[PDB]
Design a protein around this motif. Structure first.
Motif, PDB file in Angstrom:
ATOM      1  N   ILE A   8       0.835  -1.190   0.000  1.00 49.53           N
ATOM      2  CA  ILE A   8       0.000   0.000   0.000  1.00 49.53           C
ATOM      3  C   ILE A   8       0.873   1.243   0.000  1.00 49.53           C
ATOM      4  N   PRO A  11      -4.879  -3.760   6.089  1.00 49.34           N
ATOM      5  CA  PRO A  11      -3.705  -4.598   5.878  1.00 49.34           C
ATOM      6  C   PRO A  11      -3.769  -5.852   6.719  1.00 49.34           C
ATOM      7  N   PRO A  67      -4.816   1.724   9.250  1.00 47.06           N
ATOM      8  CA  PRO A  67      -4.213   1.803  10.581  1.00 47.06           C
ATOM      9  C   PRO A  67      -2.856   2.466  10.546  1.00 47.06           C
ATOM     10  N   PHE A  68      -2.575   3.240  11.590  1.00 49.70           N
ATOM     11  CA  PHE A  68      -1.402   4.093  11.617  1.00 49.70           C
ATOM     12  C   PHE A  68      -0.357   3.667  12.631  1.00 49.70           C
ATOM     13  N   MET A  69      -0.690   2.779  13.560  1.00 52.30           N
ATOM     14  CA  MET A  69       0.308   2.338  14.519  1.00 52.30           C
ATOM     15  C   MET A  69      -0.010   0.921  14.965  1.00 52.30           C
ATOM     16  N   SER A  70       0.991   0.051  14.879  1.00 55.77           N
ATOM     17  CA  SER A  70       0.834  -1.362  15.180  1.00 55.77           C
ATOM     18  C   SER A  70       1.064  -1.630  16.657  1.00 55.77           C
TER      19      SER A  70
HETATM   20  N1  LIG Z   1       6.143   1.722  13.786  1.00 54.57           N
HETATM   21  S1  LIG Z   1       4.479   2.211  14.008  1.00 54.57           S
HETATM   22  O1  LIG Z   1       3.692   1.239  14.841  1.00 54.57           O
HETATM   23  O2  LIG Z   1       4.368   3.423  14.836  1.00 54.57           O
HETATM   24  C1  LIG Z   1       3.672   2.453  12.378  1.00 54.57           C
HETATM   25  C2  LIG Z   1       2.662   1.627  12.017  1.00 54.57           C
HETATM   26  C3  LIG Z   1       2.041   1.833  10.778  1.00 54.57           C
HETATM   27  C4  LIG Z   1       2.439   2.802   9.952  1.00 54.57           C
HETATM   28  C5  LIG Z   1       3.490   3.657  10.313  1.00 54.57           C
HETATM   29  C6  LIG Z   1       4.096   3.461  11.527  1.00 54.57           C
HETATM   30 CL1  LIG Z   1       5.449   4.534  12.031  1.00 54.57          CL
HETATM   31  N2  LIG Z   1       1.714   2.961   8.582  1.00 54.57           N
HETATM   32  C7  LIG Z   1       0.918   1.780   8.117  1.00 54.57           C
HETATM   33  C8  LIG Z   1       0.030   2.205   6.716  1.00 54.57           C
HETATM   34  C9  LIG Z   1       0.924   2.523   5.699  1.00 54.57           C
HETATM   35  C10 LIG Z   1       0.686   1.822   4.852  1.00 54.57           C
HETATM   36  C11 LIG Z   1       0.747   0.746   4.757  1.00 54.57           C
HETATM   37  C12 LIG Z   1      -0.245   0.294   5.918  1.00 54.57           C
HETATM   38  C13 LIG Z   1      -0.515   1.280   6.386  1.00 54.57           C
HETATM   39  C14 LIG Z   1      -0.617   1.898   4.958  1.00 54.57           C
HETATM   40  N3  LIG Z   1      -0.013   1.325   9.066  1.00 54.57           N
HETATM   41  S2  LIG Z   1       0.813   0.870  10.335  1.00 54.57           S
HETATM   42  O3  LIG Z   1       1.398  -0.401  10.034  1.00 54.57           O
HETATM   43  O4  LIG Z   1      -0.127   0.814  11.478  1.00 54.57           O
END
Ligand SMILES: NS(=O)(=O)c1cc2c(cc1Cl)N[C@H]([C@H]1C[C@H]3C=C[C@@H]1C3)NS2(=O)=O
Ligand SMILES: NS(=O)(=O)c1cc2c(cc1Cl)N[C@H]([C@H]1C[C@H]3C=C[C@@H]1C3)NS2(=O)=O
Lengths: 49, 49, 49
Positions: free
Chosen positions: B30, B43, C43-46
């Motif tokens: 993505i 995802p 999603p933005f943070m795992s």
């Molecule tokens: N290292 S983290 O947990 O803070 C983290 C986690 C994620 C980030 C960016 C960071 Cl820095 N972007 C991804 C997004 C980006 C692209 C790909 C999946 C998603 C779309 N989601 S995520 O996997 O949840």
């Protein structure tokens, strides 16, 4: 999009991931490295004596 | 990806855009520019470079 | 979470379900039982348990 979440919450993803990555461990070299310098000696280093 | 200066998606993304395919279950990352032409689900497997 | 036998979503869920709040930038976890009433972005943070 609805189906993906059901698979994720039921853990079939983890099952398939283990199935296709780790259960095929053939060349299990498994070298990681611990910095613990207080590791004792094995007999295998000494047996020549 | 898109071609230089023509915006012609070759590869699989072009197979979704140009009506040739129906769905792509594939190891596909993505990005930004892929959102503007096709849709992604949530995802399912996390990774990095 | 939802109420037993009445589906009354309390907390931050019902604020978006019942038209009270407009948007929620907050530590909220995507589940299966939450996509039916509201929507999520990518999603933005795992994380994990
Ligand atoms: N290292 S983290 O947990 O803070 C983290 C986690 C994620 C980030 C960016 C960071 Cl820095 N972007 C991804 C997004 C980006 C692209 C790909 C999946 C998603 C779309 N989601 S995520 O996997 O949840
Ligand atoms: N560790 S990983 O890449 O194999 C991986 C990555 C993801 C999984 C499950 C696994 Cl096993 N499910 C998540 C989704 C499940 C729910 C919670 C976030 C999303 C919704 N997408 S994800 O974060 O991309």
């Amino acid at each position: 999009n609805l189906a993906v979440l059901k698979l994720s919450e039921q853990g079939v993803l983890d099952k398939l991931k283990n199935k296709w990555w780790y259960d095929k461990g053939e060349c299990g070299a498994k070298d990681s490295g611990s910095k613990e310098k207080t590791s004792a000696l094995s007999l295998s280093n000494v047996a020549g004596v | 990806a898109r071609d230089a200066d023509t915006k012609i998606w070759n590869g699989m993304v072009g197979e979704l855009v140009y009506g040739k395919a129906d769905i792509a279950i594939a190891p596909l990352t993505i990005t930004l520019v892929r959102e503007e032409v096709i849709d992604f689900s949530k995802p399912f497997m996390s990774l990095g470079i």
